[PDB]
């Protein structure tokens, strides 16, 4: 039972549960986190972006993260030995190869979590709507951190794995890629909110209908999880909402399945847009109004006003954000207002 | 706020200019409040759909087996409990639905 | 003088179209119909905004 | 700027607070604050729209 | 001869008619703006 | 204002064909029994 005895050991019952995926997950995962903290504290980003955000100089918690290897460093994967690092550790951190160290070890780790979220099922008996639901961050993670950079000049364009890092990545789209108006991203803001909303409205309704199994005013301990009938009447909740908002759910099944649906579908239809934006297909000027804007300056819409904003962000942010391009803009050239 | 889909976008951006709302902590919680809402909305949506006492044939739709007004429990807690209870450590699984659903509605 | 057209009749997709809020000239003053001099005056200064949100 | 900020946030909560207890106050007087009664559901027997 | 003993009727109740009729229009209402462009 | 000339057909087919396909299935279900 050579292979056999190994199996039942992994599948045994212990504090946590290490499955076949666990072999893949914990080493790959613990390094990601284990890497991120280290790169956060010590490894500077200086030689890469020319601006040091990292925990060991003066920088705070929020503004530290692991930047990315620079543009002219290209799409190379920056292995630890590599041609470029040549097995030298220091210069492998300074180049930000630690970034890629996080993503890849993260992704496989991120995968290894998914597989675990299967391997639990087959030996439990639940249906795997959990893993499948978890494919949305996958798509989001993969699209943002992997497909999007590859659609650019190098790794340099990508989130830097930090609190403030992700922000200079946010405005980075608004200025250049005009992201808010991308309709694939409007389906996202539906999903998330539509998730958050219905998250709160479910939790509220069932919390406002309780059969009063216990005595004391507070009903938490009042619940006995033994072979009970439904702890909250669907009958009330139904006729309830049907008279206020007008439309209710009559199926505990159809309800919850609709919770699983919207956030997921919310992200995927966003993860599509990002891919579409890796190619710089970005949703942008409506040919209708722009031509019309060429027929008079006075015509103005809350669209047209955004184009100036997205224009200012670009010019101002460009020199700092992208030093490699060696941009120098003169003063007057910046698209200042009052002009 | 100019009320409209472009008007709103114009608002935030300009609002971002003056008050630097992103770095503000209260917003930085609001994000957590929305995500964790959407997050929990997925799990509590998922785990219960995952566990369904089967009244349906494989060919037939899985939903229709639920009869409006069933006084049976349509979803096993014991099955789904250990699930999340094995996935992470068994301590945090929130045995009590009445305890869960409240926390489900407090976070967002 | 910059008038803004957020109306739908003028060349606006749903995306671009919006109800413009009230002007600065009106300030924060309560600005109902009758208080405004002319009907077109009440629209040109962004009445319908201040009417809807209330 | 501090006071107006501070007292507002607090004043905001007390709106919620008011809207909290007023719920629990009346429901308490109404007697079913302790949770819907499994024996007889008030909705159970009603004209069904 | 035998007309495929395996067949089933397709069933869509009244509700799942609305969601689609709602979903389609919304997506159109959302994507019509770009199709005009 | 100027526009994609054919963009209108897009909406119509994208509205009707998915819509219709839901009706046809539905009216069937109504006829069951």
């Amino acid at each position: 039972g050579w292979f056999d005895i190994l199996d039942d050991w992994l599948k045994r019952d212990r504090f946590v549960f290490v499955g076949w995926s666990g072999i893949l997950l914990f080493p790959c995962a613990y390094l990601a986190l284990g890497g991120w903290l280290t790169g956060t504290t010590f490894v500077t980003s200086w030689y890469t972006h020319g601006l040091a955000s990292s925990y060991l100089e003066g920088c705070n918690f929020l503004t530290v993260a692991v930047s990315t290897p620079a543009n002219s460093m290209g799409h190379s994967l920056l292995l630890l030995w590599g041609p470029e690092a040549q097995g030298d550790f220091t210069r492998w951190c300074q180049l930000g190869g630690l970034w890629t160290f996080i993503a890849l070890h993260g992704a496989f780790g991120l995968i290894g979590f998914m597989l675990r979220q299967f391997e639990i099922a087959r030996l439990v008996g639940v249906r795997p709507y959990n893993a499948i639901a978890f494919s949305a961050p996958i798509a989001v993670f993969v699209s943002v951190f992997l497909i999007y950079p590859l659609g650019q000049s190098s790794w340099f364009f990508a989130p830097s794995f930090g609190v403030a890092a992700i922000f200079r990545f946010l405005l980075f789209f608004q200025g250049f890629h005009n992201w808010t108006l991308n309709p694939f991203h409007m389906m996202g803001v539906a999903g998330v909110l539509g998730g958050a909303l219905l998250c709160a409205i479910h939790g509220a309704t069932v919390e406002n209908t309780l059969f009063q199994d216990g005595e004391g005013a507070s009903t938490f301990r009042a619940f006995n999880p033994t072979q009970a009938e439904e702890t909250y009447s669907m009958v009330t909740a139904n006729r309830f909402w049907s008279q206020i908002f007008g439309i209710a759910f009559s199926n505990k099944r159809w309800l919850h399945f609709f919770m699983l649906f919207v956030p997921v579908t919310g992200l995927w239809m966003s993860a599509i847009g990002v891919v579409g934006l890796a190619l710089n297909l970005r949703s942008y000027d409506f040919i209708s109004q722009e031509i019309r804007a060429a027929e008079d300056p006075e015509f103005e819409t809350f669209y047209t006003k955004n184009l100036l904003l997205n224009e200012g962000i670009r010019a101002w942010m460009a020199p700092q954000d992208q030093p490699h391009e060696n941009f120098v803009f003169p003063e007057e050239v910046l698209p200042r207002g009052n002009a | 706020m100019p009320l409209g889909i472009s008007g709103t976008f114009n608002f935030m951006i300009v609002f971002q200019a003056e008050h630097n709302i992103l770095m503000h902590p209260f917003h930085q919680l609001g994000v957590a409040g929305v995500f964790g809402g959407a997050l929990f909305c997925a799990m509590h949506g998922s785990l219960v759909t995952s566990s369904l006492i089967r009244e349906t044939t494989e060919t037939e739709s899985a939903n229709y087996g639920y009869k409006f007004g069933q006084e049976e429990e349509t979803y096993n807690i014991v099955a789904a409990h250990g699930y999340f209870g094995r996935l992470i450590f068994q301590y945090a699984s929130f045995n009590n639905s009445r305890s869960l659903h409240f926390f489900l509605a407090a976070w967002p | 003088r910059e008038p803004v057209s957020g109306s739908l009749l003028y060349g606006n997709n749903i995306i671009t179209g919006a109800v413009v809020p009230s002007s600065n000239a009106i300030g924060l003053h309560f600005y109902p119909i009758w208080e405004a001099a002319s009907l077109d005056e009440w629209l040109y200064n962004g009445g319908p905004y201040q009417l809807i949100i209330f | 700027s501090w006071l107006a900020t501070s007292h507002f946030v607090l004043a905001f909560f007390f709106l919620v607070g008011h809207l909290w207890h007023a719920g629990r106050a009346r429901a308490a007087a109404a007697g079913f604050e302790k949770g819907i009664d499994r024996e007889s559901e008030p909705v159970l027997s009603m004209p069904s729209l | 001869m035998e007309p495929n003993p395996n067949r089933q009727p397709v069933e869509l109740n009244r509700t799942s008619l609305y969601l689609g009729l709602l979903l389609i229009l919304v997506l159109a209402l959302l994507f019509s703006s770009y199709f005009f462009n | 204002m100027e526009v994609n000339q054919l963009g209108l057909i897009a909406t119509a087919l994208f509205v009707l064909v998915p819509s219709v396909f839901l009706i046809i299935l539905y009216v069937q279900t109504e006829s069951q029994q």
């Binding site: 009958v235 007008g246 439309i247 009559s250 | - | 060349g11 | - | 009244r14 609305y18 009729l21 229009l25 005009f36 | -």
Partner: peptide, 30 residues
Amino acid sequence: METITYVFIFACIIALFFFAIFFREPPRIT
């Protein structure tokens, strides 16, 4: 042309709402 499609699309939404609120088949108990 342009606008008149939006109002149409937006109309059928409303014509769905009023239609979907009142005309739903009541889900009876048992």
